[PDB]
Symmetry: D2
Subunit: 213 residues, 4 copies
């Protein structure tokens, strides 16, 4: 029943902002949580719980959060399957500042349209096949690195050199090995991320049509 839209692109490409803008333009930020018609799920909500050793390494920017193994892919698939079945689900909340899953959770009631966004949203064939539309937010790597540096220092309490070390060591290689090869599965490529008002209004209009019947 629900129409699932998968959204991918590299880190800091604008995935989160594109999805947030779409939902805001659809007037969903005003709808009762129990009656939202369009919701956004982030693949990062499903990052795995780290062991003491792993967290230690994460604090030093030495843990690989960009490899498919960093995510609980079974939980992702099972949650998406339940959503397609019209079931109400609970989604974990991840804290990038402490590299941990919070205690609080977000309950997702049956929706008509679901946006699932993540750096590896198209990595798994099973997950891919669940999407009726696949969008890829394409932003150059150097541009994304500049955005990631500014974002991580000002929002995630990260140190510049740690960010750059983590990026060169893990983010870049994993993006090239696991994310780029999935771009070919996208139906539509969106450049300029959240500043692309034309592409965004196009998706908004399409979703509204789907909502109207």
């Amino acid at each position: 029943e629900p129409f699932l839209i998968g959204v991918s692109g590299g880190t800091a490409s604008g995935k989160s902002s594109v999805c947030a803008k779409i939902v805001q333009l659809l007037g969903q930020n005003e709808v009762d949580y129990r009656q939202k018609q369009v919701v956004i799920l982030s693949q990062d909500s499903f990052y795995r719980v780290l062991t003491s050793e792993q967290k230690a390494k994460a604090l030093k920017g030495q843990f690989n959060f960009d490899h498919p193994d960093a995510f609980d892919n079974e939980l992702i698939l099972k949650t998406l399957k339940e959503i397609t079945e019209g079931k109400t689900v609970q989604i974990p909340v991840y804290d990038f500042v402490s590299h941990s899953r919070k205690e609080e959770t977000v309950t997702v009631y049956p929706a008509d349209v679901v946006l699932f966004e993540g750096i590896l949203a198209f990595y798994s064939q099973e997950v891919r096949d669940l999407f009726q539309m696949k969008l890829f937010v394409d932003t150059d790597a150097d541009t994304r690195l500049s955005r990631r540096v500014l974002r991580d220092i000002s929002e995630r309490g990260r140190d510049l050199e740690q960010i750059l070390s983590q990026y060169i060591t893990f983010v870049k290689p994993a993006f090239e090995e696991f994310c780029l090869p999935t771009k070919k599965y996208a139906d539509v490529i969106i450049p300029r991320g959240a500043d692309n008002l034309v592409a965004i209004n196009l998706i908004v209009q399409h979703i509204q049509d789907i909502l109207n019947g």
Copy 2:
């Protein structure tokens, strides 16, 4: 005023078939010529009339039909502006077999939506500014060459050797120098071409909305 959609991409990327699929799905092929609400204009209709020396080289695959100068940009601008003003216009008919413009012209009546497609549709800023939406059909160069070889032999009366010679000598360099750099002006990138049904349906749905108001 009519809603203009510009469509670009390299040679044989799928521009013509994408526009053709869009109007077919909109049911325009079952509407009388005078009653069509969506019409397709091709930049190739505006190739310049060749001088005798130019045609000579053209017959040997030694003329550059991929340079911006090969198109009558002044006529393109004039024609598109008149269309924007709701005027009925006559446009030339180009024959790829003879590298020449035919005697007959095509009457383009006022339509609600106009698709203008061509390898250098986004080259001119004045032209570019007339499009309310810009689409770029992105298809790999080798895939496109394959498509062009078969198409040119079967539709444009060309022979293998000349096609490859012209491609390597003029088409490839011109694409990199003049076409590729215009990709940044597109609002939406459609990979592969006419087989991309989700992207096509997104544009069809958008156009149907314009037609309904």
Copy 3:
């Protein structure tokens, strides 16, 4: 022990002609077979013997000769190791017209320098580690397709349609999945191919040094 130089690059990038130009410039074509100091080995000599079903599909351009499995990597490793040990070896002769290995084999006597070239020469780590120098011939995909079409029609008994079909279906995908990713192992990237005289002369000069001691 002999100095081994590995050479890779996509199909028709210019690997064979680059190696051929190098030995020609070193004057090896004017030296008796037994006296040659620089020899060329092609990975294509190690294609596997096809089963009846495989040859059937091969005749229709429906067999994947671009997958690592299409080569006998065990024989390649064994042969190269023996050559490294200064042993004389016999290598197979492959016929592209019939997709089969000939009855006769070629005797490879101990040489001071060995050029081993092939589309997947850097795929195997064990093989890769035997090369003291690795060169990757980088030529654009469309340029390469053009070259392959002409070469395959004139040298490998293929017809246009089948070539393009095989290329798009197996060659292109395999290059992106298996060949392209090995480019990172090259020490030197030689663009364009055999027409790159400065790059070729650099390798010739380097080899002449090895020959002089």
Copy 4:
């Protein structure tokens, strides 16, 4: 008489370090300044003197040091021509910390081999034709940005946000518009910059051969 080698690549690709390593391995750092056989000239030595307004903007990372206009190209050409004529020349010394030409200068006596390195070494046809060998140090843009950030903060007294602003606004666009299109003129592409010992020893050996006669 002198053999000129042009070296290009984007900012922080490793151009300076590659050239320095080559000269050091050739034993030139021990030779009397008046008798050096191999010398390195940097295109940055020829940055233009800024006006008061320009310097003000430079202090804010708002001046375009990546456009061909930022360099005194006539002085570059004339100096290279004089060097080819065996003339002794004087080369300005640039200070990145103060965005200015210093008073001190470096005198360059007749050399046998000259390495000229810069982000736009291959931009001018006249300058390009002076080179008998053209090398391009190829390093990914995101990797180069990370290196540039670390370098500018620790060696050029620049602020992080100013570096990123200057990079996004000027460096990246100019690299893509003016530098990338010159890569096609390179004879040899060198990856991994100064860590590529194989490629570096190859150039060293070639130069030594040129020096020996």
